[PDB]
Amino acid sequence: SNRDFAGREQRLFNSEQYNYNNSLNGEVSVWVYAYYSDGSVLVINKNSQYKVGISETFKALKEYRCGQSYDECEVNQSIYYPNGGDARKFHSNAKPRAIQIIFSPSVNVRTIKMAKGNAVSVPDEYLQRSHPWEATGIKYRKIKRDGEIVGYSHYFELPHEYNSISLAVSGVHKNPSSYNVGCCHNVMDVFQSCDLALRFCNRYWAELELVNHYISPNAYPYLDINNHSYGVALSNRQ
């Protein structure tokens, strides 16, 4: 009947979560996954109100294995300028082989912007001719579970020796209202949100460990190398 209040409250509890995240009071989140040839995965996450992003150097995206280097500094020198380095190797296995960018479903996809630079942090060959970003939202796939969008994914390989990148990405929380969250009334709150943004960074040994111990316990969206979707659908669901 309609007197199953445990049922109604369960459905409302999940719907409230879905809707709260999508309100101007909620989070918008981005993740950058860098995939290494040893099968480990670096994740960088940022979670903030209003807008959020991540910006990393070429060096910062390379694999680092905690408590386990001169040569890798020389690799960097030889990637910033051809034959600029004294490295003992042709291809550094610390270079990411691929990147996946994921946004929370509370992003507005039309606001997504990416600055994929070269190894010296120039977006498009020389600064003089560079637009500082590309709007790549059209490339984002919907990660879906049970018919619900649980996130958005952009996946690109770096399979060539010349794929040596710096990377920044940014998205704005959805706002279907005509209230500008950056209007004079609220602009200091957006400034404060820049300070309040929380960052997370970790290297998982395997995609399995990433799925088991990072994605799933936190109810985050993910798309794996086999094109399998992860996440939790909450809108009007028990």
- Our CB check for a copy of itself shows the closer of 59 and 139 to be 59
The piece of 79-87, 141-149, 154-162, 222-230 that touches a copy of itself (CB under 8 A) is: 79-87
Nearest CB to a copy of itself, comparing residues 3 and 160: 160
Least Å distance between CB 8 and a copy of itself?
A: 19
Residue with smaller CB distance to a copy of itself, 1 or 176? 176
Tokens 């794929």 identify what position? 163
Q: Is 52 in the site for a copy of itself (CB under 8 A)?
A: yes
Task: Work out whether the CA dihedral 222, 135, 196, 203 comes out positive or negative.
Answer: positive
| By the rule CB under 8 A, 10 interacts with a copy of itself | no
Q: Which of 53, 96, 137, 151 binds a copy of itself (CB under 8 A)?
A: 53
- Stretch 88-107 residues interacting with a copy of itself (CB under 8 A): 88-93, 104
Q: How far is 197 from 183, CA to CA, in rounded Å?
A: 20
CA-CA distance, 156 to 34, in Å (whole number)? 10
- What whole-number distance in Å separates Cα of residue 99 and Cα of residue 60? 13
User: What's the chain's length in residues?
Assistant: 238
Please select the residue that binds a copy of itself; options are 2, 3, 5, 69, rule is CB under 8 A.
Answer: 69
Q: Give the CA angle between residues 84, 85, 86 to the nearest 5°.
A: 145
Contact in structure between 52 and 113 (CB atoms under 8 Å): no
Closest distance to a copy of itself from the beta carbon of 1 (Å): 29
| Cα distance between residue 122 and residue 98, in whole Å | 19
Of 11, 54, 45, 60, which Cα lies nearest the Cα of 215? 45
42 binds a copy of itself (CB under 8 A): no
| 1, 2, 217, 227: residue in contact with a copy of itself (rule CB under 8 A) | 217
* Shortest Å distance, C-beta 121 to a copy of itself: 4
Residue indicated by tokens 């999940």:
14
In the chain the first and final C-alpha atoms are separated, in Å, by 16
| Amino acid of residue 28 | V
Binding-residue pattern over the window 157 to 196 for a copy of itself, x denoting contact by CB under 8 A: ---------x-xxx-x-------xxxxx--xx-xxxxxxx
- Nearer residue to a copy of itself within complex by CB, 4 or 120: 120
| The one among 10, 157, 161, 202 contacting a copy of itself by CB under 8 A | 202
